[PDB]
Design a protein around this ligand. Structure first.
Ligand SMILES: *[P@@](=O)(CCCCCCCCCCOC(=O)NCCC#C)OCC
Ligand SMILES: *[P@@](=O)(CCCCCCCCCCOC(=O)NCCC#C)OCC
Ligand SMILES: [Mg+2]
Ligand SMILES: [Mg+2]
Ligand SMILES: [Mg+2]
Lengths: 277, 277
């Protein structure tokens, strides 16, 4: 199995092959050390080859969640923590400074290892680095990076959620309220994370989950179906109409739309009290 | 200030307001009980209102990671676990069966509570459920959900990375290797998750991190820059050309492209051995 070095906030997993001075390979965007294993076989007679899964990837595991600020595009948390991981790995395996090669974003990690832990570096190689900060045209490349992230993550989510609302014929008031950006910047990054979590881990799994009509008929006397007065024509109401058609379970109309419990709390409460008070 | 019930794998947090029989509100996609607080204020002289942050949201906190299979679209782990949370919460607050209302995906949780733990339910309400499984046109609705999720989580990245690779003049063989789809559905899910993470948390933060030419000149004797022979004309090589022009640190040419260490491991190793062996 993969070797483990337990570090602050993570278990760092790495491959180790060969004998001799330590040579650490730092992966780029794939994040994992397995991409260097064919190369390690060629070098194993001359170096103790160490191919790292950086802490956010592969078989490595965080022992606590990323700090909230890591989402900031100018955060230095992850790159410095990756560099410290490499320095601690070097120190755990070798009394002498070590050889280090990084490729792509792994070469940027390697740069920070040299900057902040030069004492661990015997020789270092930067294979095809994509860092732009010191270039004369840094702004052009930084803007392209910022733009592509915004297109994939922000625009992609915004356009998909608008389509979702149209597909389910969500009433305009309800779609507005569900899409409103949070009043607090803290709440805005939390809202992106929550929406993407619901998208990946909830919507498909729950909407196609294992409920049958017979599950409703078995305890039908306990069930009320609720449709909002302000969300007519929407898909969730059609679900209730079908349950009612097939089971006879009654539909009670209640103020507000899809979010009527917050849109019209007094009127929503009055119906609940009629039902159960 | 919210209340806590510690369950298997999570600390479940909830608002509790009022006096009377227990009434549990289960939120939908927003995941948090605060959306029910204005309604709770209207009901607090009639019910002990309990408004849940479902375990993956809000002030609730997981105490063990989600199963790896939770990202699978047909997973039932989360919906069953949410339903068990409601049943255990009900048992912890009341010796009698309780009133339960869910809305949206929270109404699907409520359906699973009735199916798996009917003994805790006195009366239950399903407000605007978006479940499709038992509908006569379930295929239409299920496929629409799957398609919109696939567009956000995978297709935006596919289209955007292809344009981005063109902007950076990435060699065709590197772009194909970097975008090659894994051979299993689970492997492809993991691949897209990893690239979405790299896009949000790595590309901007690392490529605009605080490295200057002065960082290289302090330790210039230790540094080799590596350019692939099959990746000429690409942006990362221009980064190395600029470092070398300003600092004199040598460029060594090495076989393969951006991914040369795995494309041509023997030729790559030979250069490393000439450099450092
Ligand atoms: P339920 O679990 C239903 C939750 C949404 C189901 C599809 C309706 C589409 C919502 C309209 C899209 O607007 C947004 O939600 N905001 C995202 C905007 C961006 C970016 O939960 C009810 C609470
Ligand atoms: P370095 O950290 C890569 C530096 C940026 C390289 C640009 C990538 C060009 C797109 C190719 C990647 O394709 C995908 O990842 N997704 C498939 C979508 C399509 C098409 O790391 C090198 C290991
Ligand atoms: Mg240029
Ligand atoms: Mg009344
Ligand atoms: Mg696809």
């Amino acid at each position: 199995g993969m070797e483990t070095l337990e570090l602050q906030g993570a278990k760092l997993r790495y491959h180790q092959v060969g004998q001799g001075p330590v040579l650490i390979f730092i992966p780029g965007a794939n994040g994992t050390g397995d991409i260097f294993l064919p190369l390690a076989e060629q070098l194993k007679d001359h170096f103790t080859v160490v191919a790292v899964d950086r802490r956010d990837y592969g078989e490595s595991e965080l022992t606590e969640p990323l700090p909230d600020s890591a989402s900031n595009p100018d955060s230095d948390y992850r790159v410095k923590r990756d560099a410290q991981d490499i320095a601690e790995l070097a120190k755990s395996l070798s009394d002498e400074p070590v050889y280090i090669l990084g490729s792509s974003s792994g070469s940027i990690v390697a740069m920070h290892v040299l900057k902040d832990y030069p004492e661990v570096v015997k020789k270092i190689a930067f294979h095809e680095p994509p860092i732009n900060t010191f270039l004369p045209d840094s702004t052009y490349w930084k803007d392209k990076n910022d733009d592509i992230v915004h297109q994939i993550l922000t625009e992609g989510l915004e356009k998909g959620m608008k389509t979702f609302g149209e597909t389910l014929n969500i009433a305009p008031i309800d779609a507005k309220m569900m899409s409103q950006p949070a009043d607090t910047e803290e709440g805005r990054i939390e809202q992106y994370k929550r929406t993407m979590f619901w998208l990946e881990f909830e919507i498909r799994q729950y909407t196609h989950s294992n409920i049958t009509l017979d599950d409703f008929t078995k305890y039908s006397d306990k069930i009320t179906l609720l449709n909002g007065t302000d969300s007519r024509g929407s898909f969730p109401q059609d679900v209730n109409f079908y349950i009612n058609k097939e089971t006879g379970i009654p539909i009670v109309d209640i103020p507000g739309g899809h979010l009527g419990y917050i849109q019209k709390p007094e009127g929503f409460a009055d119906v609940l009290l009629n039902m159960w008070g």
